[PDB]
């Protein structure tokens, strides 16, 4: 058996089943596995990427690929206009969050 390379934040876990079926989620992970740079980088986040999944409605997923361990961190998932533009203080906190989390997991 192999340990999973995918790691869900509490927020993502809270929201995943709403936006994706298990089958769709499996395919999304498989796409990420093959192409970890699948999404586009969100500026000033230290490499967080943003990807839209077509699926109802389309979903956006935010993730970070930790290159060192080849492991994926799934931040959050949302529909159109449920998230907002970040400012400096928020990018600061978000990067610290990624870090802290990365170090607990």
């Amino acid at each position: 058996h192999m340990k999973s390379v995918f790691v869900e934040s509490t927020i993502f876990e809270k929201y995943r089943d709403e936006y994706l079926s298990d089958e769709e989620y499996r395919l999304f992970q498989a796409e990420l596995m093959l192409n970890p740079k699948l999404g586009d980088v969100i500026q000033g986040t230290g490499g967080l990427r943003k990807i839209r999944v077509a699926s109802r409605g389309g979903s956006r997923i935010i993730y970070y690929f930790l290159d060192e361990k080849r492991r994926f961190y799934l931040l959050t998932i949302y529909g159109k206009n449920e998230m907002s533009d970040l400012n400096a203080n928020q990018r600061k906190q978000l990067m610290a969050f990624m870090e802290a989390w990365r170090n607990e997991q």
Partner: nanobody, 121 residues
Framework: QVQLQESGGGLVQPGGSLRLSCAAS????????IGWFRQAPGKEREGVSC????????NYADSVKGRFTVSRDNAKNTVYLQMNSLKPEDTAVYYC??????????????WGQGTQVTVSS
């Protein structure tokens, strides 16, 4: 199953106090920002307060500023809202969210059933 558990509500006289609790269930809230919004019947959701994971950053809505104090205890997995000088305008059900930063990034959404706060004579 992850959720936030709100408690500490109740009825109080004008000028009175209450302390509200937001306790994570099914996860650890240490690294997350937490915020409060409230909803009264016939009113839209209105943001109340928010706090960063380290506690070094707090936010308050204008109409509660000065009166409310938000704090957290990470070892206890709980966030608090100290409400002082309560006004009838503060009557509402209070709800807790978890997020990546303070100020909040995501639009308000329910993490629990909330706690009722009534201030009246």
């Amino acid at each position: 199953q992850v959720q936030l558990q709100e408690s500490g509500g109740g009825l109080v006289q004008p000028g009175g106090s209450l302390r509200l609790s937001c306790a994570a269930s099914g996860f650890t809230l240490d690294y997350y920002a937490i915020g409060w919004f409230r909803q009264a019947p016939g009113k839209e959701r209105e943001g109340v307060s928010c706090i960063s994971s380290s506690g070094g950053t707090t936010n308050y809505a204008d109409s509660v500023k000065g009166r409310f104090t938000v704090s957290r205890d990470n070892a206890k997995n709980t966030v608090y809202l100290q409400m002082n000088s309560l006004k009838p305008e503060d009557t509402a059900v209070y709800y807790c969210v978890a997020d990546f930063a303070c100020p909040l990034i995501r639009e308000y959404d329910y993490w629990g059933q909330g706690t009722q706060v009534t201030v009246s004579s």
